[PDB]
């Protein structure tokens, strides 16, 4: 089992958008529960990324891939993003451990 999170680094400017993608590899399990977390620049605490508004999550179950798009980026969106997979809702769990993507360091700058 391995979760391939790409790209590993993203540099954008304010008002643009970005996409991070995670794919579950080498597993007989399908996607179950997916989550996204962000540790902002300078902060040392992870917050859950709630889907909606500027944040749009897409899921492709057949390819076991899911993505996070952030529209109208701001400088505060700079930080480290990481996906997490869990099977905790199942009555007969496919996997007893969660698995995480490798992370993406996101840098958002101004236009000048």
């Amino acid at each position: 089992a391995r979760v391939d999170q790409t790209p590993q680094t993203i540099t954008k400017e304010t008002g643009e958008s970005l996409t991070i993608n995670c794919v579950l590899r080498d597993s007989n399990c399908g996607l179950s529960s997916t989550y996204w977390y962000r540790k902002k620049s300078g902060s040392t605490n992870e917050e859950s990324i709630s889907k909606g508004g500027r944040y749009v999550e897409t899921i492709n179950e057949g390819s076991k891939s899911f993505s996070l798009r952030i529209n109208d980026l701001t400088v505060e969106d700079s930080g480290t993003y990481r996906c997490k997979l869990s099977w905790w809702t199942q009555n007969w769990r496919c996997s007893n451990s969660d698995v995480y993507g490798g992370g993406t360091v996101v840098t958002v700058n101004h236009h000048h």
Binding site: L31, T34, I59, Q90, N91
Partner: protein
Amino acid sequence: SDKPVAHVVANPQAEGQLQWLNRANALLANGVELRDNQLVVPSEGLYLIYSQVLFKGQGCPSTHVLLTHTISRIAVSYQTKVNLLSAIKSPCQRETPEGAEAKPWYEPIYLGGVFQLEKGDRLSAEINRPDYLDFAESGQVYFGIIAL
């Protein structure tokens, strides 16, 4: 009684799999057989066919969960599988946010109808999501027929 009759229940010892079992308060008599997880019809006639399955989850996942239960007929000779009874349920409208108290959901599905069957017919009772199957308690998961 002399009627062909069966009433099998899920094996509580199976690991996340719908496997039917024979006998207490279970039936399999007067010709009906259990073969390849399927009920075998011993003679032509009208049969009441019924089944119940129970699903359980600890929460709602990110993927959308459709629960189906289907009773199908496999002709002894023609190797055709046709759905006789089927139903679909959707227990989860929104994914459960992390960090809350576990609030499990439960979803039974009942099927029942009368059908003319032929000798050698095979009946199957199948689900699509074994990862949410719940057979931890008696009386919750069963599959039966009786000639009328």
